[PDB]
Design a protein around this ligand. Structure first.
Ligand SMILES: CNC(=O)[C@@H](NC(=O)[C@H](CC(C)C)CN(O)C=O)C(C)(C)C
Ligand SMILES: CNC(=O)[C@@H](NC(=O)[C@H](CC(C)C)CN(O)C=O)C(C)(C)C
Ligand SMILES: [Ca+2]
Ligand SMILES: [Ca+2]
Ligand SMILES: [Ca+2]
Ligand SMILES: [Ca+2]
Ligand SMILES: [Ca+2]
Ligand SMILES: [Ca+2]
Ligand SMILES: [Ca+2]
Ligand SMILES: [Ca+2]
Ligand SMILES: [Zn+2]
Ligand SMILES: [Zn+2]
Ligand SMILES: [Zn+2]
Ligand SMILES: [Zn+2]
Lengths: 155, 159
């Protein structure tokens, strides 16, 4: 299951109260940049519901039939490629979002993982691969050779 | 802002007078605490957070002219400044809030790394000549351990 076009679009519907708009826009862009670096895909920011990947921050019940569970636990979730809600990525705003070393969760790293799913990737079994199902902070290049092979296999 | 005195006690106290609007107070408290930890790890010094003006190191975020006689210059340029050990304003650290404060890779400047540098001055350290050193006068983002051997030797020499 994957996208049939390579010029993918995204829409940042809203923001979190934890960080400045500029920091959030940048974090999402750098996250998309990791993937386009190893594939023929490109990512374009738009401002309408016509975008392939719609990004949203929410708490508890927020629309779909999948409410978040308050602080900690599930950090976020996304859907596989397709029309409508498919391909979208949502982030639990009951979590403390930040960047780098320190308390709170890295928005940059979590976004990179969520976008992996929105592109068609599944969970990895390599505990050190980005697509590994459990959160873990890391410095340096985020994508493990397992992630790179997985995306290249699809696109 | 380059004196020649050190602190005569090792139980240093600090007070976070106010905050920046760019990050949650919890993220800021944590960033400052981790910054001080860098230095207490390689010396016999300790740092205690207090809530009165009687603290040795008072931390403040300001815009343009903010009290002393050295106003900030708006976005970019001078990021922050601190004063050498001593009484009153001496030892304090000020951050320019016209800057976009953040953490890690990305746009904006790392509050963590800049604080580490300012606290170095607040402890008595001068500027280094080694490009890789934290006390180097130019801002540069880096991952991994912030303190260079030059910084470690410099602090141990005083304390
Ligand atoms: C601290 N919580 C977790 O690690 C949590 N896992 C998640 O929230 C996953 C995303 C992280 C790896 C970025 C959920 N996910 O698979 C999203 O697509 C659990 C407590 C292990 C469930
Ligand atoms: C981006 N701006 C700079 O690198 C700026 N340097 C500073 O503001 C120094 C602090 C940085 C290294 C955290 C000022 N300082 O030495 C304070 O004690 C210059 C453009 C190089 C002046
Ligand atoms: Ca949660
Ligand atoms: Ca969609
Ligand atoms: Ca939040
Ligand atoms: Ca952090
Ligand atoms: Ca400035
Ligand atoms: Ca003082
Ligand atoms: Ca600011
Ligand atoms: Ca950053
Ligand atoms: Zn959802
Ligand atoms: Zn996942
Ligand atoms: Zn000042
Ligand atoms: Zn300096």
């Amino acid at each position: 299951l994957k996208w049939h076009h390579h010029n993918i679009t995204y829409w940042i519907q809203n923001y979190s109260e934890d960080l400045p708009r500029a920091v959030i826009d940048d974090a999402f862009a750098r996250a998309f940049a990791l993937w386009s670096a190893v594939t023929p895909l490109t990512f374009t920011r738009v401002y309408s519901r016509d975008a392939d990947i719609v990004i949203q921050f929410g708490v508890a019940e927020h629309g779909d039939g999948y409410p978040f569970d308050g602080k900690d636990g599930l950090l976020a979730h996304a859907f596989p490629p397709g029309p409508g809600i498919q391909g979208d990525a949502h982030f639990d705003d009951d979590e403390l979002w930040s960047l780098g070393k320190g308390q709170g969760y890295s928005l940059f790293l979590v976004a990179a993982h969520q976008f992996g799913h929105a592109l068609g990737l599944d969970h990895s079994s390599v505990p050190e691969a980005l697509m590994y199902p459990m959160y873990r902070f890391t410095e340096g290049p985020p994508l493990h050779k397992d992630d790179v092979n997985g995306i290249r296999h699809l696109y």
